[PDB]
Design a protein around this ligand. Structure first.
Ligand SMILES: OC[C@H]1O[C@H](O[C@H]2[C@H](O)[C@@H](O)[C@@H](O)O[C@@H]2CO)[C@H](O)[C@@H](O)[C@@H]1O
Length: 388
């Protein structure tokens, strides 16, 4: 029963309940119902469902996915006037431009930070290199040094990029998809450090988002790596935590990929004007962002008037410090292939099924191949064998 309502998709780690509250206010004033959903793998489902009755009117995701959506014709060009554009930071609009056109509304700037338990660890490590020794000390006390999601390359990228890894070479506003940097010396060093941590029993190759979060919020591990959305669950656990700069590697800052959470409008929605009214007049206001932020923190928001309030938060300062040491994600269509390729490399290397060099060599080859994700799905289905 989605006909005649605004349907919104947003990731399940974000403040979907707070977003729903904004939706209730919109409905109160306009009579238009707003249904917020948080399907799994929504970023992969969108292209499969956008044209159907199950497609959302509005989709929230980091800006990196939107170029591929726009290439496929799945997103409407948005039409904010100059007065509205002036309300958000200019660099956030840049993140949602594709072939010269605005294709989403920027919401917040997300970057990973080091999150640490101040009771277990008053002075967090400045370097990745000191982490093995630190884990040894904590293991003796029945604790561990560090746990974070090893199944999503988003979380390992800061380390892979620290000493020189890169996705696609950038020059003069353009990315060269033939110049991939996931298999250079810097990338190799980072992933090798990670794999060594696993070989030496300082981390488990199977650690995922849930496992790491439970471990940190139960006080079992001294550190985790995560974004602003995770601060809320840590609050509930009453763990005394700090949010700080990521450790350095080979004396170089970890360099997270920075995402701008953005709201795109489905090109097939018959309610694009209403979606625009909701996004500009309800969500992107102090009251709207406050409701979402109160649910799960957004990070550094794109709306100047509300960032003015949040800027005093030292956790946001750390977020922006890590963000500025990192790099903005490209939004080119090839990003989906790059992410899948790197995800495969990290997982195969961590589990020991491939060496670092083999894994990253394959990642480089596959990073521009658009068929990689679909080919991945086929492998999971195994397939049959003929009698002849
Ligand atoms: O791991 C690859 C993945 O990274 C980014 O996804 C982030 C997302 O930006 C965050 O908002 C949060 O939800 O965590 C995700 C990682 O689990 C890219 O945006 C995404 O396209 C990419 O697949």
């Amino acid at each position: 029963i989605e006909e005649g309502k605004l349907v919104i998709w947003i990731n399940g780690d974000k403040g979907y309940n707070g977003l729903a509250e904004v939706g209730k206010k919109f409905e109160k004033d306009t009579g238009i119902k707003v249904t917020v959903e948080h399907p799994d793998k929504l970023e992969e489902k969108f292209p499969q469902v956008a044209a159907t009755g199950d497609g959302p009117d509005i989709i929230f995701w980091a800006h990196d996915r939107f170029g591929g959506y726009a290439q496929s014709g799945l997103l409407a060009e948005i039409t904010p006037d100059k007065a509205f554009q002036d309300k958000l930071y200019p660099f956030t609009w840049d993140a949602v431009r594709y072939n010269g056109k605005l294709i989403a509304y920027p919401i917040a700037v997300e970057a990973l930070s080091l999150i640490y338990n101040k009771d277990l660890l008053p002075n967090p490590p400045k370097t990745w290199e000191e982490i093995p020794a630190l884990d040894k000390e904590l293991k003796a006390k029945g604790k561990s040094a560090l746990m974070f999601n090893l199944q999503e390359p988003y979380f390992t990228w800061p380390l892979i990029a620290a000493d020189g890894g890169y996705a696609f070479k950038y020059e003069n506003g353009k990315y060269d998809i033939k110049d991939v940097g996931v298999d250079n010396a810097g990338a190799k060093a980072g992933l090798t450090f990670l794999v060594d941590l696993i070989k030496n029993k300082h981390m488990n190759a199977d650690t995922d988002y849930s496992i790491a979060e439970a471990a940190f919020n139960k006080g079992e591990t001294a550190m985790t790596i995560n974004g602003p959305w995770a601060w809320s669950n840590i609050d509930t656990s009453k763990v005394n935590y700090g949010v700080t700069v990521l450790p350095t590697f080979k004396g170089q800052p970890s360099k997270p990929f920075v995402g701008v959470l953005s709201a795109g409008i489905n090109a097939a929605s018959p309610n694009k004007e209403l979606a625009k009214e909701f996004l500009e007049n309800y969500l992107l206001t102090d009251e709207g962002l406050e409701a979402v932020n109160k649910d799960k923190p957004l990070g550094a928001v794109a709306l100047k008037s509300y960032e003015e309030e949040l800027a005093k938060d030292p956790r946001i300062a750390a977020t922006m410090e890590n963000a500025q040491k990192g790099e903005i994600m490209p939004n080119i269509p090839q990003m989906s292939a790059f992410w899948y390729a790197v995800r495969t490399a990290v997982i195969n290397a961590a589990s020991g099924r491939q060496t670092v060099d083999e894994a990253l060599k394959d990642a480089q080859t596959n990073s521009s191949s658009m068929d990689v994700f679909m080919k991945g799905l086929s492998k999971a289905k195994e397939g049959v064998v003929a009698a002849a």
